[PDB]
Amino acid sequence: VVSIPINNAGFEDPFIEVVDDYTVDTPPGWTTYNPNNLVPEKRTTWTSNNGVGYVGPGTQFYNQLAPEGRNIGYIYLAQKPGSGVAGFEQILDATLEPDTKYTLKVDVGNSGGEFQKISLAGFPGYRVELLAGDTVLAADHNNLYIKDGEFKTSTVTFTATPDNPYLDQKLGIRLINLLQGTFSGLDFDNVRLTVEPA
Amino acid sequence: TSVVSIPINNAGFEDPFIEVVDDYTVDTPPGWTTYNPNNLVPEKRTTWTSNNGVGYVGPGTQFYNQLAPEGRNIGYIYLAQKPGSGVAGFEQILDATLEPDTKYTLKVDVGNSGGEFQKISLAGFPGYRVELLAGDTVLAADHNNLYIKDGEFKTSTVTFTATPDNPYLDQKLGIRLINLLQGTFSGLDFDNVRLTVEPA
Ligand SMILES: [Ca+2]
Numbered sequence: 316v317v318s319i320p321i322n323n324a325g326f327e328d329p330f331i332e333v334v335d336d337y338t339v340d341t342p343p344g345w346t347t348y349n350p351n352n353l354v355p356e357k358r359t360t361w362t363s364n365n366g367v368g369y370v371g372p373g374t375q376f377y378n379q380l381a382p383e384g385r386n387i388g389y390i391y392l393a394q395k396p397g398s399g400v401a402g403f404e405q406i407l408d409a410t411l412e413p414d415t416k417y418t419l420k421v422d423v424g425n426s427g428g429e430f431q432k433i434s435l436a437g438f439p440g441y442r443v444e445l446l447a448g449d450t451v452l453a454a455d456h457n458n459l460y461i462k463d464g465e466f467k468t469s470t471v472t473f474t475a476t477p478d479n480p481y482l483d484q485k486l487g488i489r490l491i492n493l494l495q496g497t498f499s500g501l502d503f504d505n506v507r508l509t510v511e512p513a
Numbered sequence: 514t515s516v517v518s519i520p521i522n523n524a525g526f527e528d529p530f531i532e533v534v535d536d537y538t539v540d541t542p543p544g545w546t547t548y549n550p551n552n553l554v555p556e557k558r559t560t561w562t563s564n565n566g567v568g569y570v571g572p573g574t575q576f577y578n579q580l581a582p583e584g585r586n587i588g589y590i591y592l593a594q595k596p597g598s599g600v601a602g603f604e605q606i607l608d609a610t611l612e613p614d615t616k617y618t619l620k621v622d623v624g625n626s627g628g629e630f631q632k633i634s635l636a637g638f639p640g641y642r643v644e645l646l647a648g649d650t651v652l653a654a655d656h657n658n659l660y661i662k663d664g665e666f667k668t669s670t671v672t673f674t675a676t677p678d679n680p681y682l683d684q685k686l687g688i689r690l691i692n693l694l695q696g697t698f699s700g701l702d703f704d705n706v707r708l709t710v711e712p713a
């Protein structure tokens with residue numbers, strides 16, 4: 316298996332010392348996908364936000380450690396369901412090539428438990444996107460059922476043919492909070508993109 | 514309490530009957546509506562406008578190395594606009610409603626037609642999305658997850674579990690079968706839509 320490198324693919328940057336502590340700024344190496352302007356430029360704990368969080372022993376949110384390393388990346392949206400979507404985006408240096416099969420995998424987390432006496436029960440729905448340029452080549456729109464406190468792996472594959480219109484455009488990844496339910500937060504971890512001849 | 518099929522109108526595009534092999538309609542199949550969020554499909558269609566309809570895929574067909582997945586006919590969507598211009602396809606709202614503690618399984622066969630039509634190559638594929646709705650909300654969707662070679666069909670499967678806390682319970686279920694217009698030749702076929710519900 317041959318990987319395409321991704322920056323901060325496991326959200327391990329930055330290091331977080333205290334269990335369940337978190338940042339509220341875009342993880343290094345990623346940008347905030349914000350097509351509906353739901354996430355402000357300047358965040359608090361309680362605005363719509365995204366960032367990184369440490370899942371270790373003593374976590375109140377999960378029934379297992381982080382899928383990879385210490386940290387997961389989270390997206391929280393405070394607007395009512397139906398208001399739009401937001402998430403993580405990363406554009407890669409690798410470009411779409413013909414007769415090549417791409418396999419994107421990411422672990423999707425449904426945080427459970429309670430935060431400042433607010434229940435995290437429920438899930439907003441997720442979408443995992445593989446891009447060339449601004450085009451979604453293939454995407455998993457919420458196909459996995461993920462219970463509170465658990466993670467499941469989403470897998471998206473795509474084969475580009477010689478006649479594909481998007482050849483030579485940069486590959487990208489989006490990890491999206493759909494805001495289709497409450498509690499309206501979800502987590503991602505361990506992003507992997509691998510490539511093989513068709 | 515067990516696996517039940519939810520009824521869908523004209524679910525194999527068998528209405529209308531078509532006598533000549535590879536003959537087709539260019540109007541919205543009975544029981545479905547034209548999903549047209551980017552206004553790509555005109556209200557009146559001819560062969561080479563953007564359109565949708567049904568087509569007979571039987572012995573003699575120039576478009577597939579297999580017969581129609583179900584019965585005689587498939588349903589198709591063709592888009593004349595350039596890649597990137599938008600999407601269009603089929604939509605059907607069902608009488609059934611979203612119920613809690615249930616698992617839904619939507620299956621449809623997706624066809625990448627091959628061959629030639631009026632010296633126009635059918636090689637290539639626009640991409641598809643299959644959507645399960647409640648009300649206006651796409652609960653789960655297969656956005657082009659299967660690779661489908663020219664001249665074959667593959668079955669797309671979408672599942673969704675509805676919890677007691679789902680915001681859209683009691684809203685009408687719906688189905689969308691979408692041409693993504695992300696490639697040429699910019700037509701694709703669908704057949705054999707099935708929706709089941711079972712305790713979760
Ligand atoms: Ca990690």
Ligand SMILES: [Ca+2]
Nearest residue numbers: 426435436437
């Ligand atoms: Ca949750």
Ligand SMILES: [Ca+2]
Nearest residue numbers: 382422466467
């Ligand atoms: Ca896992």
Ligand SMILES: [Ca+2]
Nearest residue numbers: 525583584586
């Ligand atoms: Ca049929």
Ligand SMILES: [Ca+2]
Nearest residue numbers: 626635636637
């Ligand atoms: Ca084709």
